[PDB]
Amino acid sequence: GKSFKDRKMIEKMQEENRKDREKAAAKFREYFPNFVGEPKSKDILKLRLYEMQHGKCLYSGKEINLGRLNEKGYVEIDHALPFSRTWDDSFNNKVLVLGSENQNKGNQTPYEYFNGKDNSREWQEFKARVETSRFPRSKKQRILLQKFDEDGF
């Protein structure tokens, strides 16, 4: 039932994804030779987001120590927009943040937490941090969303 073209793309995609997975794992091991066990998707993504965010906690702007990237409780991947209010589990909603800063934000959106409704200095600085990150434009847009319909939840 499958086309010739679909067969060839399935084979090439499977091999390219195997190479990409293999290089990402070796790069992680290069920075963390003493990592105990096998790096998982969450660990690889922590390093990717660390790089996209220029090494800074997205909520506070504080420098994340790369040596401590895998330390217990130090930094976390979490959602910018709470899943309970958005059902948004996408990559565009994922950010790397200090655990203490993430706990302070809690179930607020960034627009609420940084007082975006008053165009506060904190909101302007957060937006500036998001805008200068190496996030795709649709990811920048997601993190800064102001308007939500929570009636479906």
Binding site: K40, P82, F83, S84, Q108
Partner: protein
Amino acid sequence: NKTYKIGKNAGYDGCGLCLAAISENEAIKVKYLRDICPDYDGDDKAEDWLRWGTDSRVKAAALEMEQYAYTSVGMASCWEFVEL
């Protein structure tokens, strides 16, 4: 989809699919799928519980939690647990 604050000693580790034990309207323990099943290599999307809810160590982890509290599959996000 009831939502519960995740407690301070629950094992929070950022966003992710997880089991939660709920007591006095709070998630007192969470166990992430990625820890229960070290072979879940995915990206923590809600619809993945329709597949993963059947794995034996998920059932075993849930049964142990049920010995002390109401337990459900769901999503951890922004220090909340959402039942799925």
